[PDB]
Amino acid sequence: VKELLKYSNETKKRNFLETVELQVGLKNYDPQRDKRFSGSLKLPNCPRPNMSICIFGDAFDVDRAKSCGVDAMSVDDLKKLNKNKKLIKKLSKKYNAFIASEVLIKQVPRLLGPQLSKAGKFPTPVSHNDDLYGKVTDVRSTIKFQLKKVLCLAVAVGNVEMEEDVLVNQILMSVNFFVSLLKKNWQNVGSLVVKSSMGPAFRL
Amino acid sequence: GAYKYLEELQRKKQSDVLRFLQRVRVWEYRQKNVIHRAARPTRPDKARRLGYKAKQGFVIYRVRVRRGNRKRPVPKGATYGKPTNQGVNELKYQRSLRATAEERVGRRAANLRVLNSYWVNQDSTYKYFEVILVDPQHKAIRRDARYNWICDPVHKHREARGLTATGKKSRGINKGHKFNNTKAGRRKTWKRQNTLSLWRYRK
Amino acid sequence: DRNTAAETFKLFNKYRPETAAEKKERLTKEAAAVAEGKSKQDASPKPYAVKYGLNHVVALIENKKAKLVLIANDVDPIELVVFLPALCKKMGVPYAIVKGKARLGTLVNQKTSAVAALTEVRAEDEAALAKLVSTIDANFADKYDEVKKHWGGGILGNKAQAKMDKRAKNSDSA
RNA sequence: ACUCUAGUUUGACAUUGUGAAGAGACAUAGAGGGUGUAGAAUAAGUGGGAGCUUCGGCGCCAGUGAAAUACCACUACCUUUAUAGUUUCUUUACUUAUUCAAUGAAGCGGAGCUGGAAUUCAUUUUCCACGUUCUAGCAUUCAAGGUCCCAUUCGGGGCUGAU
RNA sequence: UUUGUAAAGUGCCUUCGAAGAGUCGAGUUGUUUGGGAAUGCAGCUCUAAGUGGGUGGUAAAUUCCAUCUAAAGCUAAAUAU
RNA sequence: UUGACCUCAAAUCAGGUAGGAGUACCCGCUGAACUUAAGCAUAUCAAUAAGCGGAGGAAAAGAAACCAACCGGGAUUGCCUUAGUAACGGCGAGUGAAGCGGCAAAAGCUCAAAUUUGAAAUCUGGUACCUUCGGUGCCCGAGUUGUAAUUUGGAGAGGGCAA
C-alpha cells in the first residue's frame, strides 16, 4: 500500500528547504529489449497541473492562427523564420498542426535535441486549438522510455495537498500497465524510486 | 503435538541436518549385520502411522538389501533360446527391494508377522529399511481388537504373498482403467478370461 | 553447567508428579469425599506437578502456557528434539538444555523423559524461578542467533592434531 | 554371413565429504574513474527545476551543442572484497566414508629425563640415541632388590624396579 | 440382577476442521499390456506440493471445467475346487 | 565410590512360536522351448509348462486419488452381453480388454495426524482366591521417543443454548 509512506502525500513537505515549486519525480521499472517501438508509447491527460511555466511557439496557418489570442502563451506565424533557426532558445515546448508540414524539415538541428520539437512520439502536431489548450497549460507528465530499464516522469508538486493529488498517480499507473505490449516481464510495477527534487527517496 | 514437526523435518532430506544424520546413520547401520534388531524406531512419526503402537509385542528390525538390477543366472551368460530372451545384465526383478527386505526379516523372525516397512537410508551399495513386525501370540496383541486380526491363520507370511504396503503396489493392485490386467489379481483375471464358458444349452 | 543444573533440579525436585501410592491416597480421599460431601473431584487441592511428554510440552509451547522448558543433550533419534530450541525462541518461552535424560526421567518418575516443563508454580518459588529464567536466558535464548550462525565439528583426532601442529609449525615458523 | 551376448575398456550421474590455490557475480556502499564539435567547464544518459546557504560561492537567465549545470536521485559504465555462500579449473593438502594388509589387535602419537654430535652471540636456538653382536647354553610362577602398611602367623596388600 | 447421577442420538449458533514423502511425479532402461509420443511393475537418477494432488486412454503450452482422495489398515455371501 | 539410563549379550532362565507334509482350487516370484508364421531372428505358443516362496476352507479383491461426461452412476467378486469390438501386430501369423446394461450376492468400517494434563485414566507377567477358554486383589515390568477415551473425510472437534 502507498498509504504508510508519502508517495504523493502530505508526509514529505518539510524535508525540502526550497520554498519554490519542486515537483515529485516517479520512475517506473520493467525490463524491455533494445528496440525502439516496444514499451509504453503514450502521453495521456494529466488531470491536475504540474505547475510549470512554458511558452508555445505556435507557427500556424490560415485556419488555425486565430484561436491563439484568447487562451495561449505566444502568437507566432510561418513568416518569422530567421529567428527560430539561429539564435533564440526562449521556449519549453512547441505546438504544431497538420496543415503546414513543409516547414518541419527546417527546424531540426536546434530544437529536436533538447526536447523542444516533435519527431513522432508526443502529441505536439494536434489540429484542435480551441479545446486542447486547457490540457497543455496545465502541464502534463513526460513518459519517455530510455535504453535498457527506466521510465523517468513527474507526477505533481510536493507542496500541493493530498486532495488534488489523490487520483493522479493512480490514473498514471493505469497507462503503463494496459497499453503495454506483451514483451514485458512479470509484475509490471516492479520498483518505484519516487523522490521529488531535494529530499530522500520514498519507495514502496 | 510434535509429530507434524517430525513429518515436516523428514520431508526435507537434502538439508544440512538430514544429510549429516543420513551419513552418520548409514555408517552406523553398515557397521552392523544385514538383518538385526532395532531397539527403537528411528522415524517414530513414520513408524507410527504405519502401525507402530509402542508397547509389548511390537518389534523393529533393520535390514540392508543389495542394490541394483537383477543379473540373471544361466552360466557364462548363455540362455540357449531365441535372441529375444537373451539378455543377462539388464533384467530388473518385478518385486521391489522393500519386498525383499520384508521377506528376509519375515524368514529370520518366523514367529512374527510383518505389518509394513519403511525406508530409512541408502548408499550406493545398499538400501536400508526398517520393518515393523508384530508378534501375534503375545497376549497384548491377541486381545484389544484393533490388532487381533493379525492373529488369524490367513495372515501367515503377508510379506511373501504380496499383502503388505509394497506388496499390493508391486502386484499392480488398484482401481482404475490403468489397472485392468491386474485389478483382482493378475492371474485370476487371466484364467477367467481365457476360460471357455460352456453352458448346458450352448449360448 | 552443573551449578545452574543443581539449582534447577532443586526447583524441580520441589515439583514432582504423583507416584502410584499417592494416587491411591487421593483415590481414597475422593472416594470418601464424593460419597459423603458430594464434592465432585474438587475436595482435593489443585496440583502443581511438572509437565512432561513430548507432544504435551510441544502443545504447551504452541499455546504459550509453559514457563520453563528443559531439553536433553541426548536422544539418539535427534529429530525429536531439534525443533524445540526453534519453537522456544519463536514463542518466547525460556529454555535450557540440561545434561542427561536420566535425570529428567528421575525427577518425573520415568526412565527417560527428554522434555520437562513448568507451567504452574506456587507463590513460594517465584523469585527463584525468575532468577533461573534470567540465568538461562543469559545462556541460551539470547545467544540463539550467534549459535545458529556457527558451524561446530571439524575437530581432528589428537594424532592428526599433533601432526598438524608439527607441520603448521614447520610450514611457517622455525 | 545376419542379429545378439557374458566378459572387459572408457565417459556421465550417484557413493562423495573437508581445507588451501586460480576465473567468473551476485547479497554488500562507496571512495573514485569513463576527453568526437560547440558551450565559464571531463554534461556516460534521463527526471524536477528558479533557487539554496548566516555569508561567500554556484545557479535561473545568456549562449551553445545530439545532449544546460546550483541541489537531490535512477540506469549504468571501469576499478576497489575490507565483510558471507556457490560455480569449472592446481592435484596441492586433509581423516572420518570406502579399499588393501597384518596381528592371540603388544609397545602408536606427543612431551620430559639424562647424556652427547652440537656453538654458545645470554641459555639452550637445535639434532640424535633413551640396555642385548666371538660361542647350536639359560631366560616362565601378580618378579628378586629397595620402600610403606596390616596387627605380626603360616602370610596378604600399595609404590618403585619397568618415565 | 437394573448393572446408571453413566453412555447414546437428535436441533440452532460461533471458532475451527489437524488428513499418510525418497513418496507422488519426471528422465532413461528392462519387462509387460489391447494401452497406441512410454498401460502396469521394477532398476538407477532427479525429487515435490498445499484453495494441494491424481485421473479425464495421441506429446506440448495457455485458460477453464469435471471427478475422487493416494503414498497406512480390517472385512461375510455370491466365485474356483 | 555406589546407583540409575542407553546400547549389546549370556543362560538345559519362565512361558511360548516357526520349520515338515498335502498341494485339486488360491497368492506371488521366476521362466523356457517344441510349435504357428507353409523358411526365420520381432512376434506366436505364453505373461504358459518346469523351478521356487506362502496360505486357507476358500484364497484373492474390497469400501473409490473409481467410472464417466450423463437427467450422471457408486466398495469387491462372479455370470450373460459389450465382443472377436476399440486397440496392438515383419498392420503378417495372430493377439485382444473396459465403461454402460440384466442378474447372483449385497455389510460396512479402523489407525496416524489435535494438551486427558485437576491427574496414563492403558497393557503384560508373577503370586493368592474363585461362580477357572476367564474374573478380583497385591507386587514388579512395559510405556510418556507416548498406552487408553474422543474423531477419521460421509464428517468431526472445542465452546454456548433449549429439549
Curated annotation (Swiss-Prot), chain A:
UniProt modified residues of type Phosphoserine: S67, S74
Gene source species: Saccharomyces cerevisiae (strain ATCC 204508 / S288c) (Baker's yeast)
Main location: cytoplasm
Record keyword Phosphoprotein present: yes
Posttranslational modification: N-terminally acetylated by acetyltransferase NatA.
Keywords annotated in UniProt: Acetylation, Cytoplasm, Methylation, Phosphoprotein, Ribonucleoprotein, Ribosomal protein
Record's miscellaneous remark: Present with 116000 molecules/cell in log phase SD medium.
Family (UniProt): Belongs to the universal ribosomal protein uL1 family.
One Gene Ontology biological process: cytoplasmic translation
Gene from which the chain derives: RPL1A
Free-text function comment from the UniProt entry: Component of the ribosome, a large ribonucleoprotein complex responsible for the synthesis of proteins in the cell. The small ribosomal subunit (SSU) binds messenger RNAs (mRNAs) and translates the encoded message by selecting cognate aminoacyl-transfer RNA (tRNA) molecules. The large subunit (LSU) contains the ribosomal catalytic site termed the peptidyl transferase center (PTC), which catalyzes the formation of peptide bonds, thereby polymerizing the amino acids delivered by tRNAs into a polypeptide chain.
CC annotations in GO: cytosol; cytosolic large ribosomal subunit
Residues with PTM N6-methyllysine: K35
PROSITE patterns linked: RIBOSOMAL_L1
UniProt-recorded Gene Ontology molecular function terms: RNA binding; structural constituent of ribosome
InterPro entries named in the record: eL8/uL1-like (IPR050257), Ribosomal_uL1 (IPR002143), Ribosomal_uL1-like (IPR023674), Ribosomal_uL1/biogenesis (IPR028364), Ribosomal_uL1_3-a/b-sand (IPR016095), Ribosomal_uL1_CS (IPR023673)
Subcellular localization: Cytoplasm
PANTHER family attached to this UniProt entry: RIBOSOMAL PROTEIN L7AE FAMILY MEMBER
Pfam families for this protein: Ribosomal_L1
Summary of subunit composition and partner proteins: Component of the large ribosomal subunit (LSU). Mature yeast ribosomes consist of a small (40S) and a large (60S) subunit. The 40S small subunit contains 1 molecule of ribosomal RNA (18S rRNA) and 33 different proteins (encoded by 57 genes). The large 60S subunit contains 3 rRNA molecules (25S, 5.8S and 5S rRNA) and 46 different proteins (encoded by 81 genes). uL1 forms part of the L1 stalk.
Protein name: Large ribosomal subunit protein uL1A
UniProtKB/Swiss-Prot annotation, chain B:
Family: Belongs to the eukaryotic ribosomal protein eL15 family.
Renumbered residue ranges of the record's region Disordered: 163-184
GO cellular component term, pick one: cytosolic large ribosomal subunit
One GO molecular-function entry: structural constituent of ribosome
Any one Gene Ontology BP term: cytoplasmic translation
Record's keyword annotation contains Cytoplasm: yes
Subunit structure comment from the entry: Component of the large ribosomal subunit (LSU). Mature yeast ribosomes consist of a small (40S) and a large (60S) subunit. The 40S small subunit contains 1 molecule of ribosomal RNA (18S rRNA) and 33 different proteins (encoded by 57 genes). The large 60S subunit contains 3 rRNA molecules (25S, 5.8S and 5S rRNA) and 46 different proteins (encoded by 81 genes).
Species of the source: Saccharomyces cerevisiae (strain ATCC 204508 / S288c)
Main location: cytoplasm
UniProt keyword terms in alphabetical order: Cytoplasm, Ribonucleoprotein, Ribosomal protein
Compartments in which it is found: Cytoplasm
Domain of life: Eukaryota
NCBIfam families from the UniProt entry: PRK04243.1 (NF003269)
Residue ranges with Basic residues bias: 168-184
Other known facts: There are 2 genes for eL15 in yeast.
Protein name: Large ribosomal subunit protein eL15A
Pfam families linked to this entry: Ribosomal_L15e
Gene expressing this chain: RPL15A
Stated role: Component of the ribosome, a large ribonucleoprotein complex responsible for the synthesis of proteins in the cell. The small ribosomal subunit (SSU) binds messenger RNAs (mRNAs) and translates the encoded message by selecting cognate aminoacyl-transfer RNA (tRNA) molecules. The large subunit (LSU) contains the ribosomal catalytic site termed the peptidyl transferase center (PTC), which catalyzes the formation of peptide bonds, thereby polymerizing the amino acids delivered by tRNAs into a polypeptide chain.
Disulphide bond pairs: none
UniProtKB/Swiss-Prot annotation, chain C:
Disulfide bonding pattern of the chain: none
A GO molecular function held by the record: structural constituent of ribosome
Source organism, top-level taxon: Eukaryota
Key word Cytoplasm present: yes
A GO CC term attached to the entry: cytosol
Keywords linked to the UniProt accession: Cytoplasm, Ribonucleoprotein, Ribosomal protein
Single biological process term from Gene Ontology: cytoplasmic translation
Subunit structure: Component of the large ribosomal subunit (LSU). Mature yeast ribosomes consist of a small (40S) and a large (60S) subunit. The 40S small subunit contains 1 molecule of ribosomal RNA (18S rRNA) and 33 different proteins (encoded by 57 genes). The large 60S subunit contains 3 rRNA molecules (25S, 5.8S and 5S rRNA) and 46 different proteins (encoded by 81 genes).
Family membership noted in the UniProt record: Belongs to the eukaryotic ribosomal protein eL8 family.
Protein name per Swiss-Prot or TrEMBL: Large ribosomal subunit protein eL8A
Organism: Saccharomyces cerevisiae (strain ATCC 204508 / S288c) (Baker's yeast)
Portion held of the full protein: 83 to 256 of 256
